[PDB]
Structure 1
Amino acid sequence: DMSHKEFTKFCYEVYNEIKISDKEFKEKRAALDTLRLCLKRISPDAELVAFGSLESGLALKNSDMDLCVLMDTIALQFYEELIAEGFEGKFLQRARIPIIKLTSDTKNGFGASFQCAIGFNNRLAIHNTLLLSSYTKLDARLKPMVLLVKHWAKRKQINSPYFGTLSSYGYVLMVLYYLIHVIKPPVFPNLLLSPLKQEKIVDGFDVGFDDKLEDIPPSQNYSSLGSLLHGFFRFYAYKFEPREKVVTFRRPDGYLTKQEKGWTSRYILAIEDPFEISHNVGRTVSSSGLYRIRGEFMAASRLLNSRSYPIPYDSLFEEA
């Protein structure tokens, strides 16, 4: 595939600038080690598990850590020890879903800008990280594609779940959906729908998937990174119908209506979590938020569709 050679070269240049460094990666590893030791002072029966982009390898520079304490009230004891240990942070006891947010470190050398969120017994988040991790190990093109889409969403201000747009995880799912169920030949098989997948029930949901990666043959898609991204932008700009359809990993042909799903009355953008199927990852998206997201997909597509010469690829990541 030599169709997008220039754009591809540019994609890999930006990727190398935005990906987390091995140094920052090692630092967050040491932070995790330190926090684990702190938790073991509270209880021998609790474990501290990393999830999210640092664990899957899909992290941008300066990303926050996402951690989960697994057990079986420890939250408050852990919080008190962490601050006694010189971390600074926030915690709301008895909260619906307790969360410790660490915002700084004063004694442990992890920096004044050390950011870490610690949840409790969130086994589902751990399993979707396992799934994302497997896909990143399956195809070398996935990691840069995800980072570039995340970087784009951030720069275009459409990566703000608290402000009516979409979480980073939401964009990752939109990427996987495209690579599995839209692009032909597929970049990836659907690991949940594999005939080798076995059911595994956690928290009332099936988190089973075909995880024996060595038995998965290499992709029959030979598209360059640039071609994959252009295709992804065009699908969500022009083809996907968010008023009617659900991004899903539970259908062999990837086809699912909001009607059938019963997601009709927030469901402005519908993205069904692959394990917690009752959760719409896009429920933070407002009507105005979706209009801006769609607008940005069209602009990205328009830029890349250009038959003119030298294309200003930089504008893809220029702010606003």
Structure 2
Amino acid sequence: PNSHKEFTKFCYEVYNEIKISDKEFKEKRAALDTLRLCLKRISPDAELVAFGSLESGLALKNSDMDLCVLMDSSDTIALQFYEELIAEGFEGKFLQRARIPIIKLTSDTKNGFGASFQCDIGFNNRLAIHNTLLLSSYTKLDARLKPMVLLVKHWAKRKQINSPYFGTLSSYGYVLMVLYYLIHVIKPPVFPNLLLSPLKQEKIVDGFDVGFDDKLEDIPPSQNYSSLGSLLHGFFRFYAYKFEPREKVVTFRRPDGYLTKQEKGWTSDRYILAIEDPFEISHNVGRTVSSSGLYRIRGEFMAASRLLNSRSYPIPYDSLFEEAPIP
């Protein structure tokens, strides 16, 4: 009811079903090891770094790898790396848009992997490596973050509100919505803001400050004793009824988490849902969200709150993950 015992038990049971298996994680590490050898051929000085969900442990079963090629010196290596992969029996796309190259491996011919093999490779994407570090740090700080993030991702995918190409929000946007709630909304806070810590030292990477208090062993445990179910209950309630998407920005650069679109200059490339990236401050993670997309997102937050506040016991908690029709 307050510690939402039956909802918490339900949440952990689902988390154990949707989290990545030991088998799948070992296969993706095997795939990274193979791809690292192809890059070594072209440049022994180049580095293939994994980032995103799998590196921060926030991945759902059957995930896609988000890789990055770190060069000191994209310059020539991108087209050269793609050539080697094609020659090694890999299928995929090479995309060259806005002077930035991307490799999208769609399949594998003759290796220890199959056709279901999907993998994205970027070049000198240093900022995404830093967002992964920040997210990893927070998971290492409290054991409730990983199940909370996975369950919100599973819910967003099932309710069809996780499509940045169809007017809704990316998985990364939901992670930042979860973190924002846990740092600046819930009382007592679940986490401190590591970017605004007095122990934070400046670190400039690609003209953005990527510094945060990363000495985690010295950060005390949370002062908030809420169960996983209670945490999720409050999250859905906040974004369903309390958060003002018209005038406010989800931010990690204000001590009280209070920031208006007017102050940011994100009024009148969309700013319908405003989520300020913690490092790339000029980037709105919610820029893909349309007005119709925001109404579906709020619509699903309200349905989630309604379910968790039903008067009719038992509560059909499974309906939270029931697949919604394609819009």
What TM-score comes out, normalization by structure 1 length?
Answer: 0.98
SS of 2:101's partner is coil
Ranges in structure 2 where 5+ consecutive residues have no aligned partner: none
1:259-309 per-position Cα deviation (integer Å, ceiling 9, x unaligned): 000000210000000000000000000000000000000000000011221
SS at the partner of 1:164?
Answer: coil
Gaps of 5+ in 1: none
Shift of 1:95: 5.1
Runs of 4+ deviating beyond 6 Å: none
How far does the alpha carbon of each residue in 1:226-246 deviate from its partner, in whole angstroms, 9 at most, with x for none?
A: 000000000000000000000
Paired positions, count: 318
Distance 1:225 1:130 in 2: 23
Quote the offset at 1:115 in angstroms: 0.6
The 3-state SS of whatever aligns with 1:67 is strand
Q: Residues of 1 paired with 2:57 and 2:95: CA distance?
A: 30
Separation of aligned partners in 2, 1:162 and 1:126: 23
Structure 1 residues 120-173: Cα deviation after superposition (integer angstroms, max 9, x where no partner): 000000000000010111110000000000000000000000010000000000
Shift of 1:108: 1.6
Mean Cα displacement is larger for which, 199-208 or 103-112?
Answer: 103-112
Cα contact 1:76–1:93 (8 A) shared by 2: no
Indicate the percent of aligned positions where both proteins have the same amino acid: 100
Any idea what SS the aligned residue of 1:93 has?
strand
Deviates more, 1:262-271 or 1:72-81: 72-81
Alpha-carbon distance between aligned partners in 2 of 1:254 and 1:94, rounded to the nearest angstrom:
35
Cα distance in 1 between the residues matched to 2:41 and 2:190? 46
**Paired residue for 1:314, among 298, 303, 318?**
318
Hey, what's the Cα distance between the residues in 1 that align with 2:97 and 2:266? 30
TM-score using structure 2 length? 0.96
Deviation, structure 1 residue 45: 2.0
- C-alpha separation in 2, matches of 1:143 and 1:288: 30
Which of these residues, 127, 131, 153, is aligned with residue 130 of structure 2? 127
Q: Structure 1 CA distance, aligned partners of 2:259 and 2:293? A: 22
Q: Is the Cα contact below 8 Å between 1:7 and 1:226 reproduced in 2? A: yes
Give, in whole Å, the separation in 1 of the partners of 2:90 and 2:108.
Answer: 4
1:169-199 Cα offsets, whole Å, 9 max, x none, are: 0000000000000000100000000000000
Structure 1 position 94, deviation (Å): 6.0
Report the Cα distance in structure 1 between the residues aligned to 2:297 and 2:97, rounded to whole angstroms.
36
CA contact (8 A) 1:180 1:187 kept: yes
